[PDB]
Structure to design on (576 residues):
């Protein structure tokens, strides 16, 4: 040392931000790490992905752990290098349920009352005539219908939640469906900050380029996963792929396209269709 | 609100501490953004008094003393704690860096000093009298006083002791840094000409001035050897604190100093405010252009 006789260390704190998920799914950990409640198919995905070209676009995974009588997966906190970050969560795919979940619910189709009540609540004209005469509905047709009230079926993604600069959270995007509404949310999220737009736009392009190469990707049905956008007042802006609770490997030597329409049986998820429109919306906003 | 944050996350902030002046082993790491400085009796006496004075908010918080590993320390805040990659400058304040008692003492056995002559002739071959040249010796007296002259101490009432810049480079050769031009130059580089950083520095200096004018501690202390420590970062957080009271001593009771007046043997005046006014002119002049 010409000038430094010792190193200094002390702790600082920042509030973690949880948009989607339930109370209890997450806990704080040391060294920028986070504990998400353990889920086997998520752990499989995170192991395969640590080794895949997509690695730079997902939080670093560090294995399962046992804390206070429960199992967790340990990963990085993507909030760590940000300061007072804003955050947006977008669920990816033209669909948010696995084919095996539809199959399974198609195997014993018990007529559902509340599912009818919720469906009329959101659109009184949604039910067919027979379904109207029944004041009830199938889990099947409902799972399928739910995807339609927001941008999921038309755009291949939907907004799960937004935490903004004033410190307010929005989570009610159940009827957020059009390009106009989405752009509008993206515009408020971002304060029209052009640098942040372009950054998000370029980050997404990189993710998309890699998804094309990615061995892991071509063989998973990537359902229930999200893009997590994080930006702060310093105009740092990144996007990551998170949430692999419902992403599952195809059988051996088999593959998905991810940009073609889902037909029941083909397991296609529309993930690239989702990502393509996201890329289009930001390009336009970023002009 | 409880609407979005299930828990708090924590992280270690880690940074190399910066020592511009002082000797090796004068300082140690402590926890919680604190630092230990090797114990000094008049410094501790100063800090206690400053913890109970208006000047408190402009000096490192003092937390008392502590014995570790065979040594006594004064515990204090690390003024670097909440900056991001700090740049630091230490300016030693006053028209003199020796106390009056130090001089009186030296004037006592005022024997000849070969070494002091040799340092003087090294720094300036034209400083010694013909008598001193011929004797290859100076007194201590003469040497102590001449020493103040080679930098801006005797004329401007301060001198730069060190700078660590955004480069991660550290300068300490301000031995012949004398003129207002040289100083402006150093500040300009230290600051990279940043207007915002300059104005904050300037206004933080003016606030300091305004509190000294009302400080019962300040007005009855011979304030020697203390520094103004400038710290700023890339986020343009910029501050200045008074530091180092190892050689700051109380005047006799019921007795006072002006601090903006010239020094004369026996008047104990340190010229502290003169130095501070100059720092303010320089920093104001720079914050225009
Ligand atoms: N690694 C991470 N870094 C930072 N924030 C994260 C991370 N993982 C999750 N989050 C935050 O936690 C929330 C929950 O994430 P996630 O979607 O994985 O949970 P979940 O239990 O799988 O919920 P769901 O299955 O309903 O999507 C996200 O919406 C996001 O705000
Ligand atoms: N509280 C503090 N916070 C941050 N830095 C400090 C603090 N105190 C001292 N320093 C740093 O340590 C250096 C030396 O401090 P100081 O002048 O008090 O030491 P010293 O032993 O009294 O030396 P000298 O008597 O030679 O001035 C300063 O140049 C400054 O960089
Ligand atoms: Mg999710
Ligand atoms: Mg999930
Ligand atoms: Mg000092
Ligand atoms: Mg000292």
């Amino acid at each position: 040392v010409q000038w430094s006789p010792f190193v200094m260390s002390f702790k600082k704190k920042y509030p973690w931000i949880q948009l989607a998920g339930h109370a209890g799914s997450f806990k704080a950990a040391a060294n920028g790490r986070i504990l998400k409640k353990h889920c086997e198919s998520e752990q499989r995905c995170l192991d395969r992905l640590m080794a895949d070209v997509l690695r730079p676009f997902v939080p670093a995974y560090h294995g399962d752990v046992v804390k206070d009588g429960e199992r967790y997966n340990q990963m990085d906190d993507l909030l760590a290098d940000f300061d007072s970050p804003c955050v947006m969560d977008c669920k990816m795919g033209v669909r948010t349920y696995l084919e095996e979940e539809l199959t399974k619910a198609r195997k014993k189709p018990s007529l559902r009352k509340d599912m009818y009540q919720k469906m009329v609540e959101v659109d009184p004209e949604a039910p067919t005539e027979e379904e109207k005469a029944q004041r009830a509905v199938t889990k099947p047709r409902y799972m399928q219908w739910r995807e339609t009230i927001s941008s999921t079926a038309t755009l291949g993604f939907r907004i799960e939640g937004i935490k903004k600069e004033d410190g307010s959270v929005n989570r009610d995007f159940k009827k957020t469906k059009t390009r106009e509404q989405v752009t509008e949310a993206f515009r408020e999220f971002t304060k029209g900050n052009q640098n942040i737009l372009i950054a998000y736009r370029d980050r997404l392009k990189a993710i998309r380029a890699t998804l094309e190469i990615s061995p892991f990707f071509k063989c998973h049905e990537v359902i229930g996963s999200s893009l997590l956008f994080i930006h702060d007042k310093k105009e740092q802006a990144k996007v990551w792929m998170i949430d692999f609770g419902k992403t599952t490997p195809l059988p051996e030597g088999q593959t998905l396209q991810h940009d073609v329409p889902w037909q029941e049986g083909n397991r296609e998820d529309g993930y690239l269709s989702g990502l393509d429109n996201l890329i289009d919306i930001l390009t336009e906003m970023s002009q």
